[PDB]
Amino acid sequence: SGDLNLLKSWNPKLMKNRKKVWETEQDLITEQQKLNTRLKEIEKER
């Protein structure tokens, strides 16, 4: 075999980890969007 790190959890370049990260971002991002819009609305009202 060649590159060992590819068979590690901690390795971020491992695909599973990347996927997890994306998911985290996606959820968090969505939340931000939800809140961001609200904030914008509030600003407009003001």
Partner: protein
């Protein structure tokens, strides 16, 4: 299904069930190379899970010559050393799960 562990999952019926569903994953999918967005629409069924799925046929009582070991801290007989199956079983019944189940039932 009756061959498989399907009934052990505790679902009513095989309609609208799938594997490895997850979320959509395309925007951050340009790290790959001539993969055509997704490599295969077909589910790969990694054999660790395959064994588990067909565990109730693969491990079974009508065996020819399997030395029936009782698995560690569980009531799950293995008729011979079958490789991935055992690991899967252990994972399932981690942290003395069998005992917990039994005791829970009793309670």
């Amino acid at each position: 299904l009756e061959h498989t562990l399907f009934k052990g999952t505790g679902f009513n019926s095989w309609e609208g069930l799938f594997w490895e569903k997850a979320s959509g994953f395309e925007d951050s999918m340009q790290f790959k190379k001539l993969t055509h967005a997704q490599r295969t629409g077909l589910s790969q069924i990694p054999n660790r899970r395959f064994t588990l799925w067909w565990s109730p046929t693969i491990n079974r009582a009508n065996v020819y010559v399997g030395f029936l070991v009782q698995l560690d801290l569980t009531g799950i007989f293995l008729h011979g050393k079958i490789p991935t199956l055992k690991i899967s079983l252990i994972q399932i019944f981690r942290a003395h799960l069998w005992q917990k189940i039994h005791e829970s039932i009793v309670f």
